[PDB]
């Protein structure tokens, strides 16, 4: 059995800085004591600086254990757990490889709920963003049964340059968005981020070689609002790639429930070999939502980074199977896969959208249910079933073997299928 965090001087309270005590537990487990295991019994554990995870350690937390984020330093990350060293900006360090870390149970309160004004986080006034994990250059990482409360315009989890990562049976509740944020900064806030390892993408380290993430599964988890703040913008994805980034591959997103996102459940550019299967996406009406995007939304959005100069490795091998969407927002698309402008040099291909079910019961629906745009070869769109809305399927400017077979369309007002030239 495990090194207890209390034995190392963590006090259960709102108030005492437990950073050191917790770090000391971890450092001892790292050596092999308590057999790599660390246990957090019931409490609220305030940390006022970053805690470092260590190779071959396994943390388990009581259901009534919370980690409370009290990192409140100007020009400094406010991320509770990192898999490598960070002190201050401009003192970044290469992160060596780390492996075999597991983290299980309890809450992390990322503590970013807004002030009564809505310009800054109540308890963490000096910060620019809050979040729970920065996983860079790691292997075999399990995050399981955890409740993630209230990131402040930030990524609850960042998975950068990391292999064999699992997110299981967790919940993500609350993303806090200042009134002042422009749309471009809002939609870059994925709650779980899966990205190549670059300094621009992952500013916590020196690693800049663009190494991919690999074999990354997000499953059996729930994403929505909290009591203290509104709905996640984008549950899972990424919004950056370049000629030097190697594309995150074998990405499985399965059996999750994306409850009323502002923008997306899954939105990404630069992935290869992804599976989005048996998920549930709900989107409520503007009126029943704390957060809502007036420029509109797309629950699955496999899109193409804005570059007109380079031949990018754009999305390939995306499978979107057996999901179900209930949409009551007239402004929301269920499924979008795109090369967004004819001006982009890369190709998007091997795209299969199958056995999905969409109930769109919105009033005066302004959007198509499924949109495939500039897909170059191997496109299958099959045995999907679509209940309600204006247009059904739209396939636009697509070359190659295109299979469209045995879809069903019900009580749609506008065009079922629609091929555009
Ligand atoms: Ca520091």
Phi then psi for 331, rounded to 5 degrees?
-100, 10
Distance (angstroms) between ligand 1 centre and the Cα of 87 equals 4
Residue 344 — φ and ψ, nearest 5°? -85, 140
Distance 249 CA to ligand 1 centre (A): 32
How remote is the C-alpha of 134 from its chain's centroid?
Answer: 12
- How remote is the CA of residue 73 from the centroid of ligand 1, in Å? 8
Q: What angle do CA 149, 152, 155 make, to 5 degrees?
A: 80
Distance 348 CA to ligand 1 centre (A): 41
Residue in the block written with tokens 């198509």: 368
176 to each of 93, 121, 229, 279, 304, how far by Cα in Å? 30, 8, 5, 24, 27
358: which residues sit within 8 A by CB, 6+ positions away?
Answer: 324, 325, 327, 334, 335, 369, 370, 384, 385, 386, 387, 388, 389
Supply the DSSP symbol for 406.
Answer: -
Site of tokens 């048996």: 278
DSSP letter assigned to residue 73: -
CA separation for the pair 274, 250 (Å, rounded): 6
DSSP tag of 31: H
C-alpha angle 90-178-143 in degrees, rounded to nearest 5: 65
CA of 81 to the centre of ligand 1 (A): 12
Q: Measure 112 CA to ligand 1 centroid, in angstroms.
A: 19
**Residue 101 and residue 157: Cα distance in Å, rounded?**
15
* Residue 26: alpha-carbon gap to chain centroid: 26
Interior CA angle at 222 toward 294 and 360, to 5°?
A: 45
Q: How close is the Cα of 119 to the center of ligand 1, in Å?
A: 24
Neighbours of 128 (CB within 10 A): 15
State the distance from the centre of ligand 1 to the C-alpha of 88, rounded, in angstroms: 5
The answer to whether 305 and 188 have CB atoms below 8 angstroms apart is no
What is the DSSP secondary-structure string of 198-227? -TTT-TTSS--S-BPPEEEEEES-EEE--S
DSSP tag of 397 = S
Q: List Cα–Cα distances, 179 to 118, 120, 291, in angstroms.
A: 6, 9, 11
Biggest CA-to-CA distance, the chain: 69
Tell me which residue range forms the domain holding 99: 1-421
Q: What separation in Å is there between the alpha carbon of 229 and the centre of ligand 1?
A: 27
Report which secondary-structure segment, H or E, holds 357. Answer: strand 357-360
Point out which residues pair with 302 in neighbouring strands.
268, 337
**Counted domains in the chain:** 1
Contact in structure between 293 and 283 (CB atoms under 8 Å) = no
Tell me how far apart the alpha carbons of residues 276 and 256 are, in angstroms, rounded to a whole number: 10
DSSP, res 113: P
Distance 239 CA to ligand 1 centre (A): 27
Instruction: Check residue 17 and report its DSSP letter.
Output: B
**Which H/E stretch holds residue 57?**
strand 57-61
Q: 226: domain CATH number?
A: 2.160.20.10
| Distance (Å, whole) CA 213 – CA 271 | 10
Ligand 1 centre to CA of 106 (Å) is 25
**Resolution of this entry, Å:** 2.3
- Taking the mean position of all CA atoms in its chain, how far away is CA 34? 33
CB atoms within 10 A of CB 372: 25
Distance from residue 393's CA to the centre of ligand 1 (Å): 51
CA of 77 to the centre of ligand 1 (A): 8
The contacts of residue 357 (CB under 8 Å, 6+ apart) are 323, 324, 325, 384, 385, 386, 387
Residue 74 CA to ligand 1 centre (angstroms): 10
Cite the DSSP H helix spans in 258-380. Answer: none
d(CA 49, ligand 1 centre) in Å:
6
- For 64, phi and psi rounded to 5 degrees? -105, 15
The secondary structure of the chain in percent helix, strand, coil, rounded to multiples of 5, reads: 5, 45, 50
Q: How far is the CA of 86 from the centre of ligand 1 (A)?
A: 6
Closest CA to 278 of 302, 254, 310, 305: 254
CA angle 298, 300, 305 (to 5 degrees): 85
Phi, psi for 14 (deg, rounded to 5) = -70, -15
- Written as one string, the DSSP assignment of 223-280 is EE--SSS---SEEEE-----TTPPPPEEEEEES-EEES-SSEEEEESS-EEEEEES-E
- The Cα 187–Cα 380 span in angstroms is 28
User: What's the count of helices (H) and strands (E) in the chain, helices before strands?
Assistant: 2, 37
Per-residue HEC secondary structure of 142-156 comes to EEECCEEEEEECCCC
Straight-line distance from the first to the last Cα atom of the chain, in angstroms, rounded to the nearest whole number: 65
As to burial, measured by CB atoms within 10 angstroms (0-12 exposed, 13-18 middle, 19+ buried), residue 11 is middle
Residue 21 and residue 392: Cα distance in Å, rounded?
Answer: 57
What is the CA angle 49-50-53, rounded to 5? Answer: 150
Could you tell me which residues are beta bridge partners of residue 276?
253, 320
User: What's the CA-to-centroid distance between 33 and ligand 1, angstroms?
Assistant: 27
Check: CB of residue 53 under 8 Å from CB of residue 100: no
User: Other C-beta atoms within 10 Å of 294: how many?
Assistant: 8
Dump the DSSP string for 127-179. Answer: -S-EEEEEEESEEEEEEES-EEEEEESS-SEEEES-EEEEEES-EEEEEE--T
Technique used: X-ray
Do 152 and 132 contact (CB within 8 A), yes or no? Answer: no
Distance in Å, CA 52 to ligand 1 centroid: 12
């Amino acid at each position: 059995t495990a090194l207890s965090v209390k034995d190392y001087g963590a006090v259960g309270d709102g108030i005492h800085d437990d950073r050191q005590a917790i770090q000391d537990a971890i450092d001892a487990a790292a050596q092999g004591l308590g057999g790599g295991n660390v246990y957090f019994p019931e409490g609220t554990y305030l940390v006022k600086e970053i805690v470092f995870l260590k190779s071959h350690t396994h943390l388990e937390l009581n259901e009534k254990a919370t980690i409370l984020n009290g990192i409140n330093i100007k020009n400094h990350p406010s991320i509770v757990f990192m898999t490598g060293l960070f002190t201050d900006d401009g003192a970044q360090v290469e992160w060596g490889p780390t492996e075999d870390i597991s983290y299980s149970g309890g809450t992390i309160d990322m503590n970013g709920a807004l002030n009564e004004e809505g310009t800054k986080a109540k308890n963490l006034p000096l910060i620019n963003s809050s979040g729970a994990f920065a996983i860079g250059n790691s292997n075999n990482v399990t995050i399981k049964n955890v409740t993630f409360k209230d990131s402040y315009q930030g990524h609850a989890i960042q998975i950068a340059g990391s292999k064999n990562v699992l997110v299981d049976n967790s919940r993500f509740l609350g993303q806090a968005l200042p009134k002042t944020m422009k749309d471009g900064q809002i939609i870059s806030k994925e709650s779980i981020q899966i990205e190549p390892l670059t300094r621009k993408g992952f500013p916590y380290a020196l690693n800049d070689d663009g190494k991919k993430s690999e074999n990354v599964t997000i499953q059996n988890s729930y994403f929505g609002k909290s009591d203290k703040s509104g709905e996640l913008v984008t549950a899972i994805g990424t919004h950056y790639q370049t000629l030097s980034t190697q594309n995150p591959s074998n990405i499985k997103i399965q059996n999750n429930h994306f409850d009323n996102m502002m923008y997306a459940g899954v939105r990404f550019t630069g992935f290869t070999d992804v599976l989005i299967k048996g998920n549930r996406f709900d989107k409520k009406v503007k009126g029943e939502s704390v957060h809502y995007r007036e420029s509109g939304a797309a629950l699955v959005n496999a899109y193409s980074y804005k570059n007109t100069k380079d031949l990018l490795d754009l999305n390939k091998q995306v499978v979107i199977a057996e999901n179900i969407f209930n949409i009551a927002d007239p402004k929301t698309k269920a499924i979008r896969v795109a090369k967004d402008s004819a001006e982009y040099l890369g190709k998007v291909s091997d795209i299969t959208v199958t056995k999905n079910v969409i109930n769109n019961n919105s009033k005066e629906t302004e959007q198509p249910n499924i949109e495939l745009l500039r897909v170059s070869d191997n496109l299958v769109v099959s045995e999907n079933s679509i209940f309600g809305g204006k247009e059904g399927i739209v396939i636009e400017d697509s070359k190659g073997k295109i299979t469209v077979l045995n879809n069903q369309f019900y009580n749609l007002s506008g065009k079922y299928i629609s091929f555009i030239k």
